[PDB]
Design a protein around this nucleic acid. Structure first.
Ligand code: NA
Ligand code: NA
Ligand code: NA
Lengths: 254, 249, 255
DNA sequence: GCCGGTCGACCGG
DNA sequence: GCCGGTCGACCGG
DNA sequence: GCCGGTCGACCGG
């Protein structure tokens, strides 16, 4: 992680920050420009490393004028896994140009990208409302994570990228929201066999950053293989539980 | 529908109206509610607004048990009730606020009949996938409660689509669509399991040819739900298991 | 490949070359970029006449030099390869009435367009697509024909004898004639056989764009055949199931 | 030319 | 301490 | 995405 080395500084700068409330306080809509606040800070203390996912792509393509077309542009990633996780559509990659750059995309894997010496850190910011105790938020697609681990193995890319999370806690205070806490955690540091997969909630992994464990002490290849086992096991578990919950109780009506 | 009769009045006040740019379409939902609250004052209610009034019109009714009785309907209670603790802890000093998962955005009630209005905003500047409409699971339970309690003329679930786009420093509505759930072919509703088990469709394209009974609608959907759930149990193996069974070992 | 070492020239001679619009009519089927194929042959012969035949043309030469060989048996035995037989031999009645006064002709269903051999055979098949429109992958070759080819390859063990390559010639309308703007070369036995798509409805044909065809297969030619069959069989079973769920159930309500 | 995955973040009738 | 639906609305490595 | 349907005509261990 490029952020961890200076986390204590981010936590310090965030605690106390305020943001004008939408004037609902729930939902992706009433999210938190707190992530914009994180970006602004990472852009200041790590300007040569901080990139919005769409910002990195625009940059990558800008320094390759001779390379045109999606085919030629995809090879620019020089990594099948990073291509899977960062890339944009075919027509979008084909139609890219100086007067038609990439913009924010709702389903982009990462909020902030940090690159240094061919090493990428996919950071995803999670904002939480402390005023209440809610369910763990969506972290990342368990299915997308499964494909990632599959591609890591097939390509032997166990030393290239990390997927980290930064949780920023806030509470209402008058006519604005105020940050009260923060917490950092790396995905590949937790126990892969203990990640809860909420199938209904877009097959998303879920947990509050402040609770995640960081005791995994094996290699990255083992983490991937272990995750895939847990993923396949849970997929079969869901397939069976769906019948007992969405079929059995409704057969009497047919 | 209590809105169908004035759909053109709602559309006329929406199309062309601009709002200062900063969900992003929320501003248009407030315009609908405000309109209804001024043209159907005695029928328009925010879901949480209805609950407070209901509880406020019966102060001598304390406790979750007695309060849950106030709905006089199992199906409606399932669709509108908040929570046991929330229902118990309710008070004139601790009212019900809006909740992200409330079934409806707007409630129109009259003659003991309820209309659950859910309005969907859409950025016409993009050609996206069909949005989430309503949980297929929540619909199934609802249909089950309709059968067990024989409530086929109590409520309707309708959707209003508000199309908008960014124009300069403002947002502007460009078109509107209306449709009724119980008027579409239940066996045709697409159920996106991964997407919160929600049924998805563009209000604009939603068919309205159904001419059967409300009971037949309920039974039909339930059959469609079960079958799809079974089919999904198979799809999961062929997509989330079979292709990864070569890494486990 | 024999033309591969000379692909640069071809790619350069083709691009820019133009041909009038086929009878000023439609631009599909056999009548569209057919003349281009001729242009490719006009070069592969004017620079490699030592080993460039147009399918039937070779067959005409395979004979003649064997007058004592007539009517089935001997004539069918001429091909010391059961595989090359299945991919180049004409009909029985056709390989009977052969003579100097009745030479073979170009047949619409011939496997290869141009044949280059030098013991080792290269079955070249040209492809042309209107780049002025995003279209579907064209029919490459018969999946069934390829399956029989692989089987026969294993049986008599001939994992070294012939190659199946394709040459793409992209063209676009320009005035009263069509012009080439690009070219793409690829070799069938160099891609992932388990990846090849089989369109059963489209004549059980393998479909893909020469330009996008991969060329990185790890293994011998033998491993390919083994691999393909495993793939072709699977798809066939899948097709059998798909048919019932699309051409049977959907209309079972009308009977 | 049909089909469906992803991001965001919420409590318990 | 553990389990898991619901709303919103997005295009094609 | 991935996935696949059409029009035009041809002869045969
Ligand atoms: Na995420
Ligand atoms: Na809804
Ligand atoms: Na062919």
């Amino acid at each position: 992680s490029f952020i961890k080395p200076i986390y204590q500084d981010i936590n310090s700068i965030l605690i106390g920050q305020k943001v004008k409330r939408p004037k609902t306080l729930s939902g992706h809509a009433a999210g938190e420009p707190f992530e914009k606040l994180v970006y602004k800070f990472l852009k200041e203390n790590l300007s040569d490393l901080t990139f919005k996912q769409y910002e990195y792509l625009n940059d990558l393509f800008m320094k390759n004028p001779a390379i045109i077309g999606h085919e030629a542009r995809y090879k620019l990633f020089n990594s099948p896994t990073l291509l899977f996780l960062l890339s944009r559509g075919k027509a979008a990659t084909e139609n890219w140009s100086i007067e038609n750059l990439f913009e924010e995309k709702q389903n982009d894997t990462a909020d902030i990208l940090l690159v240094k010496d061919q090493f990428y850190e996919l950071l995803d910011v999670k904002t939480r409302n402390i005023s209440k105790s809610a369910q763990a938020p969506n972290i990342i697609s368990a299915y997308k994570l499964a494909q990632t681990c599959a591609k890591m193995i097939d390509n032997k890319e166990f030393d290239l990228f990390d997927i980290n999370y930064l949780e920023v806690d806030w509470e209402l205070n008058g006519e604005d929201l105020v940050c009260v806490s923060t917490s950092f955690a790396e995905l590949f540091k937790s126990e892969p066999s203990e990640l809860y997969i909420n199938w209904a909630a877009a097959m998303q992994i879920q947990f509050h950053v402040r609770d995640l464990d960081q005791g995994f002490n094996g290699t990255r290849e083992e983490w991937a293989k272990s995750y895939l086992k847990h993923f396949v096991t849970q997929a079969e578990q869901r397939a069976i539980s769906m019948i007992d919950k969405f079929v059995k109780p409704f057969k009497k009506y047919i």
